[PDB]
Design an enzyme around this catalytic site. Structure first.
Site, PDB file in Angstrom:
ATOM      1  N   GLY A  13       0.811  -1.198   0.000  1.00 36.60           N
ATOM      2  CA  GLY A  13       0.000   0.000   0.000  1.00 36.60           C
ATOM      3  C   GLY A  13       0.849   1.254   0.000  1.00 36.60           C
ATOM      4  N   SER A  14       0.165   2.399  -0.041  1.00 29.23           N
ATOM      5  CA  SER A  14       0.873   3.674  -0.074  1.00 29.23           C
ATOM      6  C   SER A  14       1.582   3.994   1.237  1.00 29.23           C
ATOM      7  CB  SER A  14      -0.088   4.804  -0.451  1.00 29.23           C
ATOM      8  OG  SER A  14      -1.241   4.812   0.367  1.00 29.23           O
ATOM      9  N   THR A  15       1.436   3.150   2.262  1.00 31.11           N
ATOM     10  CA  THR A  15       2.320   3.215   3.420  1.00 31.11           C
ATOM     11  C   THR A  15       3.783   3.090   3.011  1.00 31.11           C
ATOM     12  OG1 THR A  15       0.563   2.190   4.737  1.00 31.11           O
ATOM     13  CG2 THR A  15       2.767   2.233   5.699  1.00 31.11           C
ATOM     14  N   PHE A  16       4.051   2.416   1.894  1.00 28.48           N
ATOM     15  CA  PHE A  16       5.386   2.205   1.356  1.00 28.48           C
ATOM     16  C   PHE A  16       6.067   3.494   0.908  1.00 28.48           C
ATOM     17  CE2 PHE A  16       8.519   0.054  -1.428  1.00 28.48           C
ATOM     18  CZ  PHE A  16       8.909  -0.951  -0.569  1.00 28.48           C
ATOM     19  N   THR A  43      -3.278   3.145   1.372  1.00 26.40           N
ATOM     20  CA  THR A  43      -4.376   2.491   0.677  1.00 26.40           C
ATOM     21  C   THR A  43      -3.814   1.689  -0.487  1.00 26.40           C
ATOM     22  OG1 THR A  43      -4.775   4.509  -0.614  1.00 26.40           O
ATOM     23  CG2 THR A  43      -6.175   4.134   1.321  1.00 26.40           C
TER      24      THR A  43
END
Length: 640
Positions: free
Chosen positions: A383-386, A582
């Site tokens: 996810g865009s947590t990356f 997300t």
């Protein structure tokens, strides 16, 4: 020489038939029943091997040091050492001997009872006594039980002490209402084939206070496996099931009367938990008078196993998911202690091991949310947590200037018209975006542009310094994380999508917490450990310490800034550095875009705890950040 070579082949073929369990084929290789030939007939040799070897669960008969000589003009003496595996361990250093018979044109074996076991004579008998080993316990980091063998209150009925016509149906309806059972299952249990009038037919295991017992209800204590956390740790701990005949054919050292771990840690540590069976395998004479003791040793109970899990954190992390599809991982990032490994939805391991119906088992297996999945060990797109990792790589190789402000217009973006309708999407229409703004608002377009500007070579150089492709030393089945399918993206769209945690990335929650630990160790990756007595293993110089001191302050603003995506966590009033994410998945079922909500969070002051939670196929207006308030309080007050 021409006949001695044929005699060695006969001994080799005879042992093979015994090893394969085909005793009929082995008996057909013996000579006729005579005084100095075979002692018993073919069908008698079959029954003696099938009874004796079958009683001790003999497996893997293999020989060595074979020597075939010559005595008379028709008798060839043979001898060899041999070993075999039985239900009491390996029986090694067995000195076998016998004679062959070279009449006609095929050599046979003068069978003798010493070919079953070396020192057997005539009508000697074999006795096997065994004592089951108690299965060891699985405990948390503070000694609390996660898997324990103990006494349980079993609910059952005796069909005779129930009643005749109306008194029976009234008590069945009374027992059904007093123990939360269906009146159609009590009748089905008492009408099974194995049931007799005066038998005790078990029903349910009550895990609490026993209510009033109607006419025909009775509780009987029985020993069995018990899981205190229940479904809160079913995927991690696992469950045990009855040992079948097929299990004994694969491993005779099991106990045909005991339990075997079928999944989870009960199965990964089945050998250390089940112990070793104690007993004695002896050769007797006529009656039960012992002659020779072949194998004997005392029963050794199973070893206990202490985990890094916190029993209270595991329960809170699981309950915080509210039964929705998702997973949560909590660690102490400086050491790697896995405090919690929750997966939801889940199954009942107590009901699973204490007899479960085919209906309830099919409900678990046909559930589209698939509760049997260990989601903490399942490869997901991060996810865009990356963004944090891509940003840290960008700061290390100097591609990303923290103060350089990109101009982004709208919510969609693509490099050229060559991208067709493939576009990077963001949620906040912020015109002036720098690194700090991108982390606060979770701007994918900023990340996509910085990734493309960085290039594939520099991006993979920073990624290769992590744990992609590595098999973690963990007693949990899992595949290594991967950057993409092949060693090259061969696509600007895939490179950009990989930049903000999409594309062909596959990283399970445990691997995610391992990679994200660099922000709590000044760029040092700390491998996670589940066993408490394990040594802390780390990987130094993964990302630059400068990148850590640049991103972590921005991650504080993800919580503290009023427009931060995790601003709801500021209600805690504790030092928090977080990052939400997300991910859009184009699965099947329908085709409507399934969305995954992510949350990363740790204490930026003491580095005592770290959290990675995610929701799979989230409902609308739901998120991982909305459900993390409770677990973050516990980890903050107990892991500094």
């Amino acid at each position: 020489t021409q006949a001695v070579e044929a005699g060695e082949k006969t001994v080799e073929q005879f042992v093979q038939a015994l090893n394969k369990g085909d005793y009929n084929k082995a008996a057909e290789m013996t000579s006729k029943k005579a005084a100095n030939k075979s002692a018993l007939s073919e069908k008698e040799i079959l029954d003696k091997y099938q009874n004796i070897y079958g009683a001790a669960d003999v497996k893997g008969l293999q020989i060595s040091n074979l020597k075939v000589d010559k005595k008379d003009d028709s008798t060839y003496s043979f001898s060899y050492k041999a070993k075999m595996n039985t239900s009491l361990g390996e029986l090694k250093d067995l000195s076998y001997k016998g004679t062959l018979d070279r009449n006609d044109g095929q050599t046979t074996i003068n069978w003798q009872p010493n070919l079953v076991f070396p020192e057997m004579e005539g009508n000697d008998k074999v006795s096997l006594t065994t004592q089951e080993a108690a299965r060891g316990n699985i405990i948390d980091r503070n000694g609390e039980p996660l898997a324990t063998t103990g006494k349980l209150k079993q609910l059952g009925v005796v069909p005779s002490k129930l009643g005749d016509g109306g008194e029976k149906t009234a008590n069945i309806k009374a027992i059904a209402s007093s123990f939360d059972l269906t009146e159609d299952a009590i009748n089905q249990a008492i009408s099974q084939s194995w049931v007799q009038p005066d038998y005790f037919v078990p029903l349910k295991i009550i895990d609490g206070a026993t209510p009033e017992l109607p006419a025909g209800a009775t509780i009987q204590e029985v020993d069995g496996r018990y899981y205190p956390l229940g479904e809160a740790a079913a995927q991690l701990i696992g469950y045990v099931g009855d040992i079948t005949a097929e299990d004994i054919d694969k491993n005779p050292e099991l106990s045909s009367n005991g339990k075997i771990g079928r999944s989870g840690l009960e199965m990964a540590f089945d050998k250390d938990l089940r112990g070793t069976t104690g007993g004695k395998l002896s050769i007797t004479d006529a009656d039960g008078v012992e002659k020779k003791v072949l194998i004997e040793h005392e029963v050794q109970n199973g070893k206990d196993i202490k985990l890094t899990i916190d029993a209270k954190a595991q329960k809170t992390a699981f309950d915080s998911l509210g039964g929705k599809a998702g997973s949560t991982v909590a660690t102490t990032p400086k050491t790697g202690d896995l405090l919690a490994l929750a997966s939801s939805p889940s199954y009942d391991p107590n009901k699973m091991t204490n007899g479960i119906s085919q209906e309830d088992y099919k409900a678990y297996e046909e559930n589209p949310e698939q509760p049997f999945i260990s989601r903490f060990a399942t490869g997901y797109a991060p996810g865009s947590t990356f963004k944090m990792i891509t940003a840290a790589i960008g700061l290390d190789n100097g591609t990303i200037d923290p103060n350089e402000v990109l101009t982004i217009n709208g919510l969609k973006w693509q490099k050229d018209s060559s991208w067709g309708s493939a576009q990077v999407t963001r949620v906040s229409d912020v015109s002036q975006v720098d690194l700090k703004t991108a982390l606060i608002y979770s701007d994918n377009i900023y990340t996509a542009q910085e990734t493309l500007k960085m290039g594939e070579k520099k991006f993979r150089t920073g990624l290769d310094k992590f744990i992609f492709g590595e098999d973690l030393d963990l007693p949990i089945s899992m595949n290594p994380a991967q950057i993409s399918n092949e060693d090259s993206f061969n696509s600007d769209i895939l490179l950009a999508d990989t930049g903000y945690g999409q594309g062909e990335l596959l990283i399970n929650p445990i691997q995610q917490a391992a990679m994200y630990s660099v922000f709590a160790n000044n760029g040092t990756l700390v491998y996670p450990k589940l066993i408490a007595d394990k040594e802390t293993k780390d990987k130094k110089n993964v990302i630059g310490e400068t990148a850590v001191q640049t991103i972590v302050p921005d991650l504080r603003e993800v919580v503290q800034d009023v427009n931060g995506t995790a601003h709801s966590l500021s209600a805690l009033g504790i030092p928090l550095a977080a990052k939400t994410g997300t991910a859009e998945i184009k699965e099947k079922q329908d085709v409507k875009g399934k969305e995954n909500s992510f949350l990363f969070a740790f204490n930026p002051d003491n580095q005592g705890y770290m959290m990675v939670s995610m929701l799979e196929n989230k409902e609308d207006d739901d998120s991982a950040t909305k459900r993390a308030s409770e677990l973050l309080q516990y980890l903050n007050q107990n892991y500094q």
